Amino acid sequence: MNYLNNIRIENPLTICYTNDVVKNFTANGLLSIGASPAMSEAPEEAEEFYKVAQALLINIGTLTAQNEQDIIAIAQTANEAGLPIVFDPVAVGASTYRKQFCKLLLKSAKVSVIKGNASEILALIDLDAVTIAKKAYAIYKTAIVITGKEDVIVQGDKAIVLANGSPLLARVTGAGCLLGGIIAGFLFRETEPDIEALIEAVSVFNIAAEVAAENENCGGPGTFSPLLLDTLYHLNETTYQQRIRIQEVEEN
Amino acid sequence: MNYLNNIRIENPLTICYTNDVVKNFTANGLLSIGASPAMSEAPEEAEEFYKVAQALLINIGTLTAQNEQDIIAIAQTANEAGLPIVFDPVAVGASTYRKQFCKLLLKSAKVSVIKGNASEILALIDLDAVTIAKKAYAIYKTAIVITGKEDVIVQGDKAIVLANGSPLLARVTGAGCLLGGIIAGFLFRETEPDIEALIEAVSVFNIAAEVAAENENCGGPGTFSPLLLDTLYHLNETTYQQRIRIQEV
């Protein structure tokens, strides 16, 4: 729990350019762990905001022509500011439009973490999630987080598999979108984040989910979501250490 | 409960072009009944998405000049793909802007279900909800669903009145907007849906509402909403069949 303590004390400004289905939830998730979310989308204020921010989330969930050039521009402004970017290529394998855009973005800007499910990361690189993550790491030289039944993180010389969470998470819209935000919350302006911050980010989210789903007042996916936020807000070190399941670790 | 069982097993890709106040709630209500919502608004991906989707919801709740040509373009893409459209002409009677746009949309594309309240449907056509629904059906030759104190569905030669639900539903924003999305979830790519699918869609939503409002942890409109989602998620055949209150006119 080292990084989450710091988020609660320092309240890191976390800029989110995210999709319209999950903006509120993302912001509430970030507030619950003690970050300071800001959903700024205007390239006109990116330079001023990014000087003082700790990370940027770019999530293309509801990509449209209105967003494309603005996303490219703010990614460049982030790179020039030294602001780390968490990129979520939502449903990139579902259309050529999203594929072509994600290729353009990743040619145009360096991101610090690419986060997606196996199908999304596979689609970016053109099979085990670990193999897909390592291939993506070799192509982008950027931390890769692949969410799934077990989560996989590849960063630097390590690959790790994590095994926490609840099935109710799949039934809440934007769970993995909120995870992108949480990961941005853990970066503290490090453009090459320590794998330990990414492990903590993913573990905090998934452990909170596990605990929320066991709460006696969790009656389904509607009641789960408020509980998940409560649980993120209250999560303590004892619970984190008792529950964390980090299942394999591979050093290159 | 035939169709709901199929939603839960097949997880139908349900495209929703909806308004900015209700996107999250709509996606969560669709996820709760087992559908796979996708809020795609880019005409550039409509052809790919629609080929594999089961329905499209078009809801004009926050219509602006940024949306108008895109909505027309995607509705045409949907027709070409055989993807059925559910159209919600939100607040159409409140402005000439919305009236003109809904007229344009309905001259540009064939829709599969038109859903609104009595005042919205009346404004489309220009006193009883049943009469209004039957007049609209005669104009558009498209299933009409009028939500209200009692709901009315008219499809082909049948008209039905349903009498389930809760007053709390009006106090949760986008209830009816979510209903539009639930209806889209029950279409399974049928451009002329069976009246039984529409009856089930409306009935599942309303009965879930009724049951959520009776829950001992429902303390008002704020706790009602998460309960509604739980109740949609858990709704079973037994409860459906015990509670459903339907009449053929």
Next chain:
Amino acid sequence: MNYLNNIRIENPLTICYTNDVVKNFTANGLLSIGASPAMSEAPEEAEEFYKVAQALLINIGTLTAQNEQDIIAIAQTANEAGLPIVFDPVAVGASTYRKQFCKLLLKSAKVSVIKGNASEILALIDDTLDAVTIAKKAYAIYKTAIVITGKEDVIVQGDKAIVLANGSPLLARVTGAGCLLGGIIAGFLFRETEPDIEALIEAVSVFNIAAEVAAENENCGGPGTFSPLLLDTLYHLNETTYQQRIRIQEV
């Protein structure tokens, strides 16, 4: 509780041009006290809607180029219609982009209530220390009711300044609490372009007392469960609870 009773009965149409993070919550908060929220953003329908509406909220939380000209246009349509505007200059102090826009808006239209935190109101007047002093300086510049939210809230309208001391710390941990409060204030205007300070005190007090009561509920387990409870509490709030809890001081 006077004005809240009228909201419950009259169901005032409350137009909200607000930010994308808080639309749904704002709308639900307005529904819970009995208002009729409408998130209309198209200038093409503003004249027709505004003729029948009771207030407009303008909140610039997620300002972009797509919004700028539209906001200016609707604000002018509101003035012409006699529709009172509640303006929330979110994060104005965080960029020159927002500062320039808020200066343009307030040179282009007359608003009826300006609501923000101390740092937001300060940035408005600086770019023209105590929250009371800030509120009075802003009132002098704009001749418009000022509401400054904070640990204690401040309201300045005409010759009166009031400090209110209700609420809960969980409100800060729910996104868009104060954004919703902008909406609630709009709900309490009833087409009065110079609202009585009493309406503003009630609007702020209803919200903060409901927050206080929600946070005491035995089912409140944190900021996730708090938000549904806040809505329930707004729905149920009664005069007995309001009069027992309200903590107000005239400066």
